[PDB]
């Protein structure tokens, strides 16, 4: 059996997929895997798909620029892999679900919101705000827990010639908004946004999420941010953190390996912290950032791909992924963490800090509309002065209500 496997090359690198594929072929001598890894995995497989040649299994989460996963989800072109949760992990005698940590099978994995899983969870990386711990301590600053403190810090930093905030690409606001929305309104309000409850963007809580972000990207943003907020130059904005020209950026644990070969200010130490909330004593949420592994409905070897998918939750697979910081969402995989990951996961141990996860529902779609463009990509426009706060809200409410109608 020959499996065609396409995987996204992100901050964790592609060598881990080469080694994992090699390790599966050593365990399972009857399976050969043709692995394709690429930073542009959409452009690789989409021509073959529209020509009839589909890969058997794809590693690509929600949130890409092309939105390939969401598109195939809209065309009902992604195989139901709920039975993968019950499969025996190759090399072991445990089921996939026996090994999964809590709070990783949800709206992201069940984009139609039922009991059917279509995107199996990949990785397990906390997202929040990444900064230089040493730079903050050198200036006598403490990590803000509220946005009032965050903007007062922005003023203090601005007086020293340091921008408060930057971001790699606008897409990185999926984790940011997941935290900020849940911080302000709570869990039910969060699910309501993700599932397009009518007029949810007209609520005071959704307006406050937009006002806070509007103030951030229009008054406390590194001036070079939007010009570099693309797939080719996103690391430039990330470098401004290592250079000390920007304090904070929304990011996840892949940043450590992704910026492994980069210069940085003397004494640089990674800092990690939840996005601040708006109210004293409010819960702060860290985003469980996962990507997805999935099988197209047109795949020709679904059964062999499912068995290989189960192997991605094995101890062997987890130890290979872990070398670059990619922590598979299996139990105990945060025990015995590498030192460079401790600052990130230790944020879960802070008082009144919990987890948030999920993405937008795929149960409805409207031609010409894209809620992820209206919420995430619209930051670039808002930061550029092309979109007012009222225009931002009106667009989100219109798109969300339209999606509600379907
Ligand atoms: C620029 C890039 O590819 N970065 C990836 C990173 O993808 C981003 O992950 C964050 C998580 O908050 C957001 O989902 C963001 O939208 C992602 O960026 C998109 O992904 C790719 C496909 C690209 O088209 C971008 O233009 C999009 O903005 C990965 O999470 C990370 C780990 O694999 O590696 C890279 O850094």
Author numbering: 37 to 442
From the paper:
Here, we analyzed the uptake of LNB and its fucosylated H1 and Lea trisaccharides, as well as the mucin-derived disaccharide galacto-N-biose (GNB; Galβ1,3GalNAc) by an ABC importer from the HMO-utilization specialist Bifidobacterium longum subsp. infantis. Specialized extracellular solute binding proteins (SBPs) associated with ABC transporters mediate high-affinity capture of ligands for translocation into the cytoplasm through permease domains. Based on these data, Blon_0883 from B. infantis is henceforth designated as a GNB and fucosylated LNB-binding protein (BiGFL-BP). BiGFL-BP adopts a canonical SBP fold (structural cluster B), comprising two domains joined by a tripartite hinge with the ligand binding site located at the domain interface.
The Lewis a (Lea) and blood group H type 1 antigen (H1) trisaccharides were both bound with about four-fold lower affinity than the preferred LNB ligand. To bring insight into the binding of fucosylated LNB forms, we attempted to co-crystallize BiGFL-BP with a commercial preparation of Leb, which resembles a superimposition of H1 and the Lea trisaccharides to assess whether the protein can accommodate both fucosylations simultaneously. Surprisingly, the structure of the co-crystallized BiGFL-BP, revealed electron density for the α-1,2-linked fucose (Fuc) to the Gal unit of LNB, that is, we got the structure of the protein in complex with the H1 trisaccharide. This indicates that binding to the Leb tetrasaccharide is too weak or unfeasible, relative to the H1 trisaccharide, which may have been a contaminant present in the commercial preparation. Interestingly, a partially solvent-accessible cavity large enough to accommodate a monosaccharide was observed facing the C2-OH of the Gal moiety, another less spacious cavity was observed at the region around the C4-OH of the GlcNAc in LNB. Potential hydrogen bonds from the side chain of T101 to the C3-OH and C4-OH of the fucosyl unit were observed, whereas the main chain amide of the same residue has a potential hydrogen bond to the C4-OH. Another hydrogen bond from T205 to the C2-OH of the fucosyl was observed. Notably, the methyl group of the fucosyl unit is accommodated by an apolar pocket formed mainly by the F44 and the Cα-Cβ bond of S100. The electron density of the fucosyl is less well-defined than that of the LNB backbone, indicating the potential flexibility of this sugar ring.
